[PDB]
Every structure is written in structure tokens, then in C-alpha cells.
Design a protein around this ligand. Structure first.
Ligand code: NAP
Ligand code: NAP
Ligand code: JBO
Ligand code: JBO
Lengths: 206, 206
């Protein structure tokens, strides 16, 4: 089940950047889909392959997923306060391409709001949560090996590797470092214990 | 006074009103952003400039921050404990305005709960705290000269100017008077020793 080639979607984001950096240092052959190349830092850890394109364009997604061993999805639309379907339409383009190229493993990040009561969502975050739910459906109904990662507040604490993962629930803390989050994303490429589960990562920092 | 023009956000609120009163008394030229339905009281001290608008509108925050030397943030939700992003989104707008207009100094109020063990946050206060956490992260990673003011319970005790300021930890009492809290927000304008630090003002009133 060895995973060497991965595609990262959302590589230029807050979590994406440290996931990409960790993935490149751990030996992964990384393909990233970016809309603008000047957002990848020109120093240190760089991906092996850059596809310049858009996750809503099925051609770009197919070019990105071709010949991978697994996909990591760290898509976000931080700015959208009103109904939005970019992530879920991106998931559809990813699901379809995974199927046409025979890639069976996807690890995708939504949010811990999908595990807590709906009344916990702040009004201005309801649209992205609604599309998070829509993307979770696309991936769950796809048949693929899909690890759902639903993190709480994403912090800037240093990497620890010591976080807890509670399977289909909510655990001790309400924070995961972006570094620890990307670590867990990459850890999910090395096991099947989270396949078809919802994972909540959190850790007590200092 | 090097600092003489300041914007106060949340000047109509419980701490903001006494902070506005002390700032005018101390000779500051104060600009306030007020929501249309909630103007400052009739008999109260008059600021030098009033912008009517909303902290969620980037245009109104830009109008308020332009031409200022420094910014004080005392936004809140009154006694409304509902999930919100008004403080974090507003801080996002304040951060953008300050960078555009060349304002560096922002003194912003979140809460002592960002210094304490997260397991101790009372569940009734977690939603508002989750936004203080979002707001603090916005301001922390802004790169601006940001004083994180993290008070415990806000009381109605007198202005003393004799409170303790604890750096990057919990202090010796669990209360600060709204008047002392506002005194400290203004004290932070006259010194750079707290820039980049978290600050916990507390006092014993007797
Ligand atoms: N902030 C939190 O505390 C928190 C908590 C729980 C869950 N989450 C969720 O976790 C996920 C990742 O979080 P994050 O903050 O790391 O994301 P982020 O910083 O907002 O980055 C979003 C990524 O998705 C890319 N993207 C957006 N639309 C795209 C499109 N049409 N085509 C290609 N790429 C696109 C972005 O590319 P560009 O650089 O071009 O924009 C970027 O790389 C998000 O969905 C977020 O809602 C966040
Ligand atoms: N024991 C405590 O009370 C305590 C302890 C620790 C920390 N804190 C936190 O300290 C901060 C200040 O506390 P406080 O009691 O002085 O505040 P407050 O009385 O709740 O006042 C909130 C201020 O922010 C304004 N505001 C709210 N939404 C706005 C919007 N969209 N646009 C523009 N202005 C808006 C409000 O204006 P309007 O008049 O229009 O409403 C008001 O002036 C709060 O964030 C609070 O959560 C409180
Ligand atoms: C901030 C955020 C979140 N945040 C959370 N999600 C789950 C649990 C806790 C939180 C939190 O913020 O504490 C979720 C989706 C999108 C967004 C963003 F960046 F777009 F605004
Ligand atoms: C009361 C409150 C607090 N309270 C505290 N915060 C920090 C430390 C101690 C306390 C306390 O009151 O014991 C925090 C945020 C918002 C709110 C409010 F007014 F909106 F309800």
C-alpha cells in the first residue's frame, strides 16, 4: 500500500504550505495545483511537479491527479460569507479524476463544525460549512478510501507530532497547530485505520 | 504627545465609554466608529470625529483608521454569547486599514481565557472565546505593533491606575475595573514595552 506520489490541493494555503514542506522533506513526490506560482515560496522545500490551473476546471484537476498514489485536499475559500460551491465542485472534479486514473485514497479537510451541533456555527461561517458538508458528501458517497479530517481552530504553534486523534467525535482540546494538522494529513497516507472515518485532531500546547 | 489621533472601536460599549471619556480628558483627538442605531449618549464626552458605519464594512473601517496614530479595539457582543465572527472579521478589516494607511500601533482587547487552560473556559463563554482566539491570531500574525490585552472579569469598581499588569500569564486577581481596563488601553499608547506581548491587567478593589 506504499504511497510515494501525492497530489496536494490547497498547497498555497495556511495548512497547505506546511503540509507541502513536510511532505517534500519526508520524501514524497508532490504534485500541486496552484492558480499562481509566485505564492509557492522559492526557497527550501519545493514540490516535484507544479500544475498551474484551477480546481473548478476538470482538465486541470485530471492533469493533477494523473498517476498519483493518493490525494490530499486542503482547499479553502476563507473569504466567502454567502452561499458558495467551490470546494464541493472541486471535490467532484477530484473524485471523477481519481476514478479515471485509478487513485483510491483521498484525505480531505473540512472542519469540526461537521461534528458539533449546527447551532455552533457563526452566521457568517454557515455558507462555507454548508459547502464543507456538501464536499463531505461527494467524498463519502464516492466509494474511494476517504479519510475525513475535521479539525477545530487551526493554530500557529510549532510542530509536535504529539496530538491526539479521536475517531468520529471530539476530543480534549479545541486547537490543532497547522503544522500538526499537515503532519496528520500525511500520517493518513501510511495506514487504513482512519479510512472511512471522521477524524478530529487536537492537542494541548503551551 | 507623539500619539495624538486615535480611533476607538467599541467606544459605545461598557469599557469603550470610560476609555473614550479618559482619552478626551487626556487631550487625545478621538475618532469613533459607531453603528447607526447606537450613537454615543447625549450628555457624554464628545469625540473629535464620528464615523457612522459597521466594523464588518471595510470601507467604514478605512474611513475610521485613516489619518490616525494608533488604534484601540474594544469590540464585543454585549451580553450576547452566540457564535460570532464580528470581532475577528472586524480585526481583519482593522488590520487591512492600518496597513493601507501606515498605522502600526493597535491595542486590542480579547480575554484572559486566551492565557488560561482551555479546559477551564466555561462552556457558556466558549463561542465568544472562539472568536477572541480568531481575533488574536489575526492581529498576532498581522506584523503590526500589537498589544494583546487579555483581561479577566470586567467590573464597575473605580478608576485607580494602580492595577497590576501581568505579562504573558495570569495575574494575581480575577477582576479588572472597566475604568482601569480603559486606563491601561491608553497607557499602552505611551510605551512600546508591551508590543508583541499578551497582557493581563487585574486588581483588588478595596
Ligand atoms: N482557519 C481555521 O481555523 C479552520 C478551522 C477548521 C477548518 N478549516 C478549514 O480547513 C481547510 C483548510 O484551511 P486553510 O486555512 O489552511 O485554507 P486557506 O489558507 O484558506 O487556503 C485555501 C487553499 O485552497 C486554494 N483554493 C481556493 N480555491 C481554489 C480554487 N478554485 N482552485 C485551486 N485552489 C483553490 C487556495 O489557493 P490560493 O492561494 O490561490 O487562494 C489555497 O491554497 C479550509 O477549508 C478551512 O475552512 C479552517
Ligand atoms: N467580564 C467581561 O465583560 C469581559 C471579560 C473579559 C473579556 N471581555 C471581552 O472584552 C471586550 C470588551 O468588553 P465590553 O464589555 O467593554 O464590550 P461591550 O459592552 O460588549 O461593547 C461592544 C462594543 O463593540 C461595538 N460593536 C459590536 N459590533 C459592532 C459592529 N459590527 N460594528 C461596530 N461596532 C460594533 C458595540 O457597539 P454598539 O453600541 O453598537 O453595540 C460596542 O460599542 C469584549 O470583547 C468582551 O467579550 C469581557
Ligand atoms: C475559521 C473557520 C472555521 N473555524 C472552526 N471550525 C471548526 C471548529 C472551530 C473553528 C474555529 O474557528 O474555532 C471553520 C471553517 C472556516 C473558517 C474560515 F477560515 F473560513 F473562517
Ligand atoms: C463575561 C465575559 C467574559 N468573562 C471572563 N473572561 C475572562 C476571564 C474571566 C471572565 C469572567 O467573567 O469570569 C469573557 C468574554 C465575554 C464575556 C461576556 F461579557 F460577553 F459575557
Amino acid at each position: 500500500m506504499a504511497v510515494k506520489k501525492i497530489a496536494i490541493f490547497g498547497a498555497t494555503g495556511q495548512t497547505g504550505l506546511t503540509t507541502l514542506a513536510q511532505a517534500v522533506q519526508a520524501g514524497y513526490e508532490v504534485t500541486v495545483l496552484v492558480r499562481d506560482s509566485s505564492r509557492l515560496p522559492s526557497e527550501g522545500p519545493r514540490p516535484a511537479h507544479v500544475v498551474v490551473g484551477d480546481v473548478l476546471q476538470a482538465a486541470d484537476v485530471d492533469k493533477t491527479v494523473a498517476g498519483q498514489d493518493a490525494v490530499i485536499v486542503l482547499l479553502g475559500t476563507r473569504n466567502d460569507l454567502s452561499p458558495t460551491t467551490v470546494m464541493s465542485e472541486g471535490a467532484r472534479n477530484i473524485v471523477a479524476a481519481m476514478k479515471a486514473h485509478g487513485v483510491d485514497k483521498v484525505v480531505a479537510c473540512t472542519s469540526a463544525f461537521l461534528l458539533w451541533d449546527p447551532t455552533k456555527v457563526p452566521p457568517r461561517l454557515q455558507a462555507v460549512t454548508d459547502d464543507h458538508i456538501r464536499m463531505h458528501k461527494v467524498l463519502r458517497e464516492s466509494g474511494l478510501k476517504y479519510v475525513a479530517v475535521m479539525p477545530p481552530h487551526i493554530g500557529d504553534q510549532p510542530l509536535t507530532g504529539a496530538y491526539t486523534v479521536t475517531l468520529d467525535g471530539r476530543g480534549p482540546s479545541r486547537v490543532i497547530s497547522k503544522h500538526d494538522l499537515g503532519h496528520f494529513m500525511l500520517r493518513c497516507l501510511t495506514t487504513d485505520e482512519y479510512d472511512g472515518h471522521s477524524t478530529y485532531p487536537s492537542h494541548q500546547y503551551q
